[PDB]
């Protein structure tokens, strides 16, 4: 690799993500959005499901 | 998976696409699932000469 090549000849670092979906015991997921708590009003809640 | 390829072969990492980066180096299936990421890096992988 040289710093003067045409774009098609300079290097490219590359990374590919591949993962199974056989629905095996879940190992990865990341929302977990948490809202501030409200008290003394009848409110719709979702506590860990 | 991580590796470095030329800048005209980046396209070769795709399901069942022919070329010279997915013919004898490494090839992924045609029913592949996931994502791919590439970025031209010419300031750390390209020297003068």
């Amino acid at each position, epitope marked *: 690799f*040289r*710093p*003067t090549y045409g774009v098609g000849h300079q290097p490219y670092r590359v990374v590919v993500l591949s993962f199974e979906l056989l629905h095996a015991p879940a190992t990865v997921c990341g929302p977990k959005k948490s809202t501030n708590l409200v008290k003394n009003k009848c409110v719709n809640f979702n506590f860990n499901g | 998976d991580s590796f470095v390829i030329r800048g005209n072969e980046v396209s070769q990492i795709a399901p069942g696409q022919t070329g010279n980066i997915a013919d004898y180096n490494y090839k992924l299936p045609d029913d592949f699932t996931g994502c791919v990421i590439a970025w031209n890096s010419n*300031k*750390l992988d390209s*020297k*003068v*000469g």
Partner: antibody, heavy 119, light 109 residues
Framework: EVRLLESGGGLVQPGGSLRLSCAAS????????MSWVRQAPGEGLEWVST????????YYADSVKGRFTISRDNSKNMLYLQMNSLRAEDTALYYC?????????????WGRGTLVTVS | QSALTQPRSVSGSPGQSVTISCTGT?????????VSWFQHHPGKAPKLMIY???DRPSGVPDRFSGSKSGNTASLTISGLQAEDAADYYC?????????FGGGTKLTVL
């Protein structure tokens, strides 16, 4: 990223004294040997001097021994060449180089060079 | 020479701003984005203030800034201090060579 910068050229009189400097950037200066290579008008490239990554090892070319002194300050990422008894055959463009991407003893990274003129 | 064209001299008053221009050819400034700016006092090594047209290396205040348009690069120094007085060189890495401008001596009166 990785850059080499030569410095310290100017007009000096024959038998005079000069200090060259080389400024490293984008890599671990103290992990790598540094060398000075010059190119005098009409002549090919000439290796002048090499200093190891530490500073405890200095190598010089026969054509300039005694009169040339290579040095490095690993705290400041700077390389130096002290040229004394400067002669006319020392007029040249001066380069510092190292082997960050190949090996310690090679010159793969280069500066553009600084011009030293001996009247 | 073939160096990038810089002013030979620029003057500014301390605390004020000064802009320095650097015009080259289609093989250097207008070829790649590998343009550097250097502070220099003859007899000592330049200190890298700008590499990567607009990015500052370590230890250089944001008073020094860089820009590019076409084959012309521009350095701007804000908040001039007496110690900013020096020679300033633009610089371009072009693959097969690096090339400096002829330099601008900045005097802070």
């Amino acid at each position: 990223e990785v850059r080499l910068l030569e410095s310290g050229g100017g007009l000096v009189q024959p038998g005079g004294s000069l200090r060259l400097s080389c400024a490293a950037s984008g890599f671990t200066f103290n992990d790598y040997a540094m060398s000075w290579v010059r190119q005098a008008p009409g002549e090919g490239l000439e290796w002048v001097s090499t200093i190891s990554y530490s500073g405890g090892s200095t190598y010089y070319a026969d054509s300039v021994k005694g009169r040339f002194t290579i040095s490095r300050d690993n705290s400041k990422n700077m390389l130096y060449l002290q040229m004394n008894s400067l002669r006319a055959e020392d007029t040249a463009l001066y380069y510092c180089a190292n082997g960050v991407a190949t090996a310690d003893w090679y010159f793969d990274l280069w500066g553009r060079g600084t011009l030293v003129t001996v009247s | 020479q073939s160096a990038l064209t810089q002013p030979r001299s620029v003057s500014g008053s301390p605390g004020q701003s000064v802009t320095i221009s650097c015009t080259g050819t289609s093989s250097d400034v207008g070829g790649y984005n590998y343009v550097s700016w250097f502070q220099h006092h003859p007899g000592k090594a330049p200190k890298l203030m700008i590499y990567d047209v607009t990015d500052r290396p370590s230890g250089v205040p944001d008073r020094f800034s860089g820009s590019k348009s076409g084959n012309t690069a521009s350095l701007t120094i804000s908040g001039l201090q007496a110690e900013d007085a020096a020679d300033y060189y633009c610089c371009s890495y072009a693959g097969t060579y690096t090339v400096f401008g002829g330099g601008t001596k900045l005097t802070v009166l």
